[PDB]
Amino acid sequence: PLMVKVLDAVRGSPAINVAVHVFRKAADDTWEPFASGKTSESGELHGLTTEEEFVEGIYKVEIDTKSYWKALGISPFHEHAEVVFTANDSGPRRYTIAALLSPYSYSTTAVVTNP
Amino acid sequence: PLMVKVLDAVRGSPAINVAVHVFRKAADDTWEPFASGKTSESGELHGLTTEEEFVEGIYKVEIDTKSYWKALGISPFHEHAEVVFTANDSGPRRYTIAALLSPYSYSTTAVVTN
Amino acid sequence: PLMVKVLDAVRGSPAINVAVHVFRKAADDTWEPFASGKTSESGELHGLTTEEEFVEGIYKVEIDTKSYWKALGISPFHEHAEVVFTANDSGPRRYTIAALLSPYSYSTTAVVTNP
Amino acid sequence: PLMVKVLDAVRGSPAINVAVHVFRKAADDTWEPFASGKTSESGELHGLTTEEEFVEGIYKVEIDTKSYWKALGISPFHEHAEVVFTANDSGPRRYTIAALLSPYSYSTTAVVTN
Ligand SMILES: O=C(Nc1cc(Br)c(O)c(Br)c1)c1ccccc1
C-alpha cells in the first residue's frame, strides 16, 4: 500500500538507487523506524510494507537526495526530502509518493487511491 | 500589470539574461508580438507593458530556455517554455508569471494580486 | 515511443479524461496535427504513435488543462500546458511527458529512455 | 541572510499568514528552535535572523501547510512541509527558501545569491 517513485530533472530519467527511509510517529512522539529501501532502475521502490503492518498513523518518508546527488559527484542544496502525512485514518488506502529532483529544488506529490 | 520571473533549479539562482517574448492572440487566432525583454540579475523582467495596453485577452509568454541552458554548457530537453493564459479584468490586477527551470523539467505558477 | 501522464495536485489522483494534442513542426514552420487522445483512469495516455511514424522532428504536446478543470467546475488560470521538444535526433528514443496540475500552476518533466 | 516565501498554487496568490519555524541541528542531533514567524501579505517572511546568528550548520524550515489549508476550508495531505539544508559560508551569502503549495503536493527551491 505504499510506493515511492523518484525522477531526476537534470538527466530526464528515473532516479536510481535512491535510499528511502520511512518512519512512523510513536506513542511518545518520537519517529520510529518503519521501513526502508532503495529505488530500482525504474525509479520505483516497491515492497516497503504490507496492508497488515501499515496501520493508521503519522508517517515520514525521507528521500535521501543528498546521498543521491553526491553519489553522482554533485554538491546539492538539501539534506533530504521529507514527506510527512497521516495515513489510513478513514481506512486502508494506497499511497504513491512521487518526487522530482534537481540539485537545488524538489517537488513531491501524493496519489492516494481506495482499493 | 505583468512581470515575469525565472529561476534556475540546477544552480539555485535567478535565471539571468533569459529572453522572454509575450504575444497576444489576434482575432484570426495568430499570435501577435506584444512585448519582450531579458531577465535581470534578479531573474525578473519588469516594465513589459502598461495597464492601458494590457487589455483582456489570451496571452502567451515564451521563455527561451534552450539558449539559457546552452550558454551554461548544458544540453536541455525543451525548445522553450510556454505559458498561455487569459487576462481577466474581474480578477486581481497584477500578474506575476514565475517559472522554475531544470534541463528536463519546468514548472510555472501565476501569482495574481491587487 | 511517446506516453503522456497527468496527475492532479488538488485531488491527489490521476487526472482522468484530459485531452492531449500532439503536433509536429512541418517544413513550412507550421504546426501539423500529429496525434491526439485522452488520459485514462490511470492518468496515462498510451498508443499515440508508432516507432515508424514518430520520426525526427520538433514536437508540441498540448495538454488541455483548462478543459480539464472546467469539466470539474473550476475556473483555472492557463489555457493549456505546452511541451515543445526535439525528438529522435540521435535515433529513436522513448519519451514520457509527465505533468502535475493545479488551477494556477503546473509542472512538467520528461523521461527519455533508449530502448 | 534567510528569507522564506510561500505561494498558493490553487488560488494563484501568496500564502498569507502561514506559520514558519526554523530549527538548527544541535551537537546531539536534536532540532533546536532558531527563529519563527508568519508570512506577510506578500507571502514572505523577512527578518528571521541576522548574519551574526546564522552560522554554518544544518537547518530545518518547517512550514505549517496543514493549518493554512484548513483555514481555507480545504483538506490537505501533508502535516507540514519541511526543508532541510546546510548553510555553507563558501557559497553565496543570501538564502531564499521558496515553497509552492497545493493540497497534495509541494515544491521547494533555494535561491542563493550574493
Ligand atoms: O510526479 C510526477 N511525475 C510522475 C509521477 C508518477 Br506516480 C509517474 O508514474 C510518472 Br512516469 C511521473 C511529476 C512531478 C513534477 C512535475 C511533473 C510530474
Ligand SMILES: O=C(Nc1cc(Br)c(O)c(Br)c1)c1ccccc1
Ligand atoms: O514560483 C516559485 N518560486 C518563486 C516565485 C516568486 Br514570484 C518569487 O519571487 C520567488 Br523568490 C520564488 C516556485 C516554483 C517551484 C518550487 C518552489 C517555488
